[PDB]
């Protein structure tokens, strides 16, 4: 179970659907780090996403409906289920992707975080959920700059010490 999202400076994420700033950076970003790995998206990303599902990755679609037909993505109803995926897989785990409804339910279950946070600020009214980055440790972290001042940004990995 690991956290995988972006946020400016102030900590936003996405408003209105479609992210705040364009980050080409950024999207590589998301891909490479869920290549093999389980995606965890909310049904309200997951209809917003540009490009479903993710050409060889692991795509899971979150929703309260019953009747959610999604073929070739993975589809769920209950945390509990994404669980237990996660733990029957031996070469993927279970790692999210938001939107914010599902970095909440996950928050208390988490093992690995990763933020990427930009230099420049943008506004908006959803941002990530409030995580304990006290009780979790940054084990990599790198910085790439852009030819635009608000595109740079830096990966931030965390884990769970114990
Ligand atoms: N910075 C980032 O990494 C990311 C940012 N974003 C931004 O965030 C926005 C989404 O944030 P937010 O408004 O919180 O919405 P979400 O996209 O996080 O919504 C998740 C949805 O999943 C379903 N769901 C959540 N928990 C459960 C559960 N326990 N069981 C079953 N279904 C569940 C609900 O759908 P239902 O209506 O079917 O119950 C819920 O609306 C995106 O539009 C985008 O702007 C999006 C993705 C990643
Ligand atoms: C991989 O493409 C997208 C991915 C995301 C979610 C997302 C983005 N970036 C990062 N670092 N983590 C994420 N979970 C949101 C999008 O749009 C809101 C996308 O389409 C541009």
């Known amino acids: 179970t690991a956290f995988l999202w972006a946020q400016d400076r102030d900590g936003l994420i996405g408003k209105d ?28 990303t997951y209809e917003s996403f540009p490009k479903r599902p993710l050409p060889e990755r692991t795509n899971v679609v979150l929703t ?5 037909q999604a073929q070739g993505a993975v589809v769920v109803h209950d945390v509990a ?12 785990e279970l790692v999210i992707a938001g939107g914010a409804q599902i970095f ?12 990427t946070r930009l230099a420049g600020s943008f506004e908006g ?19 790439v700059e852009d030819t635009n001042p608000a595109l740079t940004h830096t990966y931030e990995v965390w884990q769970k010490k114990a």
């Open 125 to 143: 009214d959803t941002k990530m959920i409030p995580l304990n980055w006290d009780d979790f440790t940054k084990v990599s972290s790198r910085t």
């Open 64 to 68: 309260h409906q019953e009747d959610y």
């Open 17 to 44: 659907g479609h992210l705040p700033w364009h980050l080409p950076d950024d999207l590589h970003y998301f891909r490479a780090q869920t290549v093999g790995k389980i995606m965890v998206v909310g049904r309200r």
């Open 81 to 92: 289920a994404v669980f237990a995926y996660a733990k029957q897989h031996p070469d993927q």
């Open 104 to 115: 909440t339910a996950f928050k208390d279950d988490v093992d690995t975080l990763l933020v």
